[PDB]
Amino acid sequence: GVQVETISPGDGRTFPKRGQTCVVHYTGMLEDGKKFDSSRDRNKPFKFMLGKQEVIRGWEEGVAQMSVGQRAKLTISPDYAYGATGHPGIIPPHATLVFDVELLKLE
Numbered sequence: 439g440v441q442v443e444t445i446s447p448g449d450g451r452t453f454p455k456r457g458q459t460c461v462v463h464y465t466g467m468l469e470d471g472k473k474f475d476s477s478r479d480r481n482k483p484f485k486f487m488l489g490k491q492e493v494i495r496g497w498e499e500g501v502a503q504m505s506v507g508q509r510a511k512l513t514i515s516p517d518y519a520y521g522a523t524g525h526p527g528i529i530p531p532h533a534t535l536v537f538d539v540e541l542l543k544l545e
């Protein structure tokens with residue numbers, strides 16, 4: 439599944455709805471491995487629409503339980519991420535992913 443551990447609390451009231459755009463910053467790394475991506479480096483926040491299957495399942499379920507302002511460590515098992523195939527060139531088969539995700543804003 440996806441485990442959500444809080445780094446800094448959000449407001450505890452404003453949670454994403456299906457169909458809303460979540461605006462986030464993230465850093466991704468392989469569990470006890472390499473950092474492979476960060477929107478912070480790029481100075482540009484990542485946006486995705488919750489519930490449209492644009493992103494991996496662990497993000498869909500993980501971000502849905504976060505409130506605005508929250509920063510959390512998401513640990514995502516391979517079956518909630520890229521599974522036995524991985525993501526070619528970047529994520530190997532059967533990788534556990536850890537993301538640091540900060541929910542900035544909803545649009």
Ligand SMILES: CO[C@H]1C[C@@H]2CC[C@@H](C)[C@@](O)(O2)C(=O)C(=O)N2CCCC[C@H]2C(=O)O[C@H]([C@H](C)C[C@@H]2CC[C@@H](O)[C@H](OC)C2)CC(=O)[C@H](C)/C=C(\C)[C@@H](O)[C@@H](OC)C(=O)[C@H](C)C[C@H](C)/C=C/C=C/C=C/1C
Pocket residue numbers: 464466474475484486491492493494495497525528529
């Ligand atoms: C350059 O950076 C990439 C993101 C990179 C790619 C490689 C991975 C390691 C990674 O580094 O991100 C990464 O850290 C990662 O694993 N992410 C990104 C952050 C959210 C979680 C995860 C992810 O789900 O990636 C996604 C993962 C790689 C693929 C998806 C996994 C779930 C599955 O349901 C989807 O099937 C459809 C495919 C990539 C994304 O988050 C982007 C936004 C979404 C898509 C490409 C598809 O959903 C696409 O389908 C046609 C769409 O509907 C989109 C919106 C259409 C518009 C025009 C395309 C925008 C493309 C943006 C691409 C971006 C910023």
